[PDB]
């Protein structure tokens, strides 16, 4: 049916731009690979998982995702039951077979096109309505999902709240922030130091609350598109084609990819330092904690200690007056964390609490996190580039963040590429300048 | 004295830029 007199081999999948049916097998077969992975990897992680040892010290990145939703863990991120892990893993792994079946089926047996084998499923790219509608269906499926989380947290068990009053623990959220003024406030937050935008979310109420809003707002738009067609501008503005639509979704993922990179790198809440590693700033903070703690025991008055530059070996002031840790760590004075907060006063680190309220669990927390900063090599040798071999470790936060910046990036190229193609395809010149009517040749010389 | 020399050459390169962009030889087709 389709061969070189369609597209070139290495652009093969573009030969499916107009075979709805087969183009469905792909998406159903692909969606299989993701479940397969998710499932197959979880079991791989669990197969190697050692209960009495930090998750971040085991190259885990899925078990910690489950742990956050309050599963198999308890006080301080202590692993209680590995069953929920095994479950989530096998279930996915199975569903991968189910989906994979459909994919293979729709791509090599079933109808090569859909429009005729059922007009409901068959579709037309330029069919502004079918499009607005299918989009509408998916906008609801995703919306239900957003609530599927709100449920697990409020009814089915909770989530891992590291800020837990009694100290990190699985907690049931029964008071989601629904106040729009606050929820949407986040979107109006600067993305720079301090005000961190979305990534500044720091308590589960907002997380849960906000997801409540998204679920509804999302399904609402799902119905709205089901029941409509793009207006006028919406039409005189966009390009309506198979590629153009792709592109738009490409640029969309890219952006979400960058936002994700920063979330796992900066956020403490939805990414508990207990399962992942300590954050970049969190670790630099802990070094200051550790040594202010040490030397203070040797009889040093941290409050008045003067360092080489005359700035304050242990404590100094930020640009707006607050008391922070000194040293290069002055750049991370925006770090907040369960272990360190009880030392903060209304003006920042309180010299009295630091002087006699430091608790042992904090001293060892600071020590732990200090010696587990997110520094490591490709071959997984934890530490600074000049370090010695021995401690095989690279923070999950480093792995996640890099992988996703690469993907996020290439996708932005993907966007540019597929969008550039769509605009030339539409107007129609994505295959060359018309030897005959060469546009440039009809334009006045600027010379 | 040095500052002046550095800025001068710079100022000269920018002048060049101008003339190069706006005072090139109009690029003529076929009959050249």
């Amino acid at each position: 049916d389709q061969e070189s007199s369609g597209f070139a081999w290495w652009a093969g999948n573009a030969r499916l731009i107009n075979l709805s049916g087969k183009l469905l097998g792909a998406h159903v077969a692909h969606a299989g690979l993701i479940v397969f992975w998710a499932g197959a990897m979880t079991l791989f992680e669990l197969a190697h998982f050692i209960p009495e040892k930090p998750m971040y010290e085991q190259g885990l990145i899925l078990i910690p995702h489950i742990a956050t939703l309050g599963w198999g863990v308890g006080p301080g991120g202590e692993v209680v039951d590995t069953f929920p892990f095994f479950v989530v893993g096998v279930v996915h792994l199975i569903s991968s077979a189910v989906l994979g079946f459909g994919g293979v089926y729709h791509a090599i047996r079933g109808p090569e096109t859909l429009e005729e084998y059922s007009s409901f499923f068959g579709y037309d790219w330029k069919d502004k309505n079918k499009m607005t509608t299918i989009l509408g269906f998916h906008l609801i499926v995703l919306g239900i999902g957003a609530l599927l989380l709100v449920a697990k947290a409020m009814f089915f068990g909770g989530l891992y709240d590291t800020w837990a009053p009694g100290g990190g623990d699985v907690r049931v959220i029964t008071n989601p922030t629904l106040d729009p003024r606050v929820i949407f406030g986040y979107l109006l937050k600067s993305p720079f130091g301090g005000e961190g935008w979305i990534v500044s979310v720091n308590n589960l109420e907002d997380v849960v609350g906000g997801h409540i809003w998204i679920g509804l707002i999302c399904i609402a738009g799902g119905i709205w598109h089901i029941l409509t067609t793009p207006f006028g501008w919406a039409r005189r503005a966009f390009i309506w084609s198979g590629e153009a639509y792709l592109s738009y979704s490409l640029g969309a993922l890219s952006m979400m990819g960058f936002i994700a990179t920063c979330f796992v790198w900066f956020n403490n809440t939805v990414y508990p330092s207990e399962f992942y590693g300590p954050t970049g700033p969190e670790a630099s903070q802990a070094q200051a904690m550790t040594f202010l703690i040490r030397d203070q025991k040797l009889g040093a008055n941290v409050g008045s200690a003067q360092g080489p530059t005359g700035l304050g070996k242990y404590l100094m002031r930020s640009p707006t007056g607050e008391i922070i840790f000194g040293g290069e760590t002055m750049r991370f004075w925006d770090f907040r964390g369960p272990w360190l907060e009880p030392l903060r006063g209304p003006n920042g680190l309180d010299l009295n609490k630091i002087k006699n309220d430091i608790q042992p669990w904090q001293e060892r927390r600071a020590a732990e996190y200090m010696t587990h900063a997110p520094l490591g090599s490709l071959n997984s040798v934890g530490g600074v580039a000049t370090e010695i071999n021995s401690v095989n470790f690279v923070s999950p936060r480093s792995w996640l963040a890099t992988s996703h910046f690469v993907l996020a990036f290439f996708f932005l190229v993907g966007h540019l590429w597929h969008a550039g193609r769509a605009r030339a395809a539409a107007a129609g010149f994505e295959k060359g300048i018309d030897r005959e009517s060469e546009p440039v040749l009809s334009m006045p010389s600027l010379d | 004295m040095e500052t002046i020399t550095y800025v001068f050459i710079f100022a000269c390169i920018i002048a060049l830029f101008f003339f190069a962009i706006f005072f090139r030889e109009p690029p003529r087709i076929t009959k050249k």
Partner: protein, 340 residues
Amino acid sequence: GWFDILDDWLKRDRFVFVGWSGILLFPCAYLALGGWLTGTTFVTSWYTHGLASSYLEGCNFLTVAVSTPANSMGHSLLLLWGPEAQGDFTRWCQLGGLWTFIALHGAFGLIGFMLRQFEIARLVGVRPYNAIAFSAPIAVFVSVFLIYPLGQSSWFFAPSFGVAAIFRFLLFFQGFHNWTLNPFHMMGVAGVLGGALLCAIHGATVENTLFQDGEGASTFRAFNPTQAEETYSMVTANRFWSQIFGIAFSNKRWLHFFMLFVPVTGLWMSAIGVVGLALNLRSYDFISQEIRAAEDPEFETFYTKNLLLNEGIRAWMAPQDQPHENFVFPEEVLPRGNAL
């Protein structure tokens, strides 16, 4: 006459053209490549640099290398049958005979190859600008792997053949010669960096300024291997750049000559800079800067900063990097900032 028969045979059009040049090229080119591949996996650099340097010892593709000879050897050609090795092969290996082997052989191999271009050019009847161009890489190899160490104490300070073993050559040059601050190295990079730009930029300008000569999307097939019309709108390209950059080509003959010039000139300059580093005639400091830094302790530029980085590189490396000097730097003498 046999000569013309010998010729006849050589200049015969095979799969892999031999030619008179080949009589020099292939023997060498293969020996050079061979010696490397040999040492990389079998010979060590223990008796030479106190370093493991082959797969057989545990090195991976990055850490392996054919290390230079001892500093004792000096500039000795280190011939298999010379005063050093004395005909013995294994000793030769342990004294780094394999370095001058790869070096000197590959050297002739670059001569042979350029000659080849010259010979094949002549036969096929085309202009030799492919040979002129290749002078650039010769210069680099010649000045760096030969002229340089010829100015130093011995072959020991020439770049050792290997991946990592080359990175230290880089770090060394920063630390000891403050090479990055050299006008010639800069031109060098301006050319290589600028050359890799023309490359990319011209390529894209062509692929996105093409005429349609086919009905397919994959426009590759739509090309006439047999000349005729220009395959891309040279006229459109001109207008594009003339409006986005302000300047734009308009004489493919020049646009292409320019592409030969930029990177070949760059490498030539980077060579001269090194020919000067041989005598240690480096571009290390700016005297006016040093004088002000001496009298005034609060004057600080990104330059002074760098020089301190060099001091550290030299002090912390010199010991295991120049074994023949039996350096011993007490912990208290080692330059270091606070805490680190």
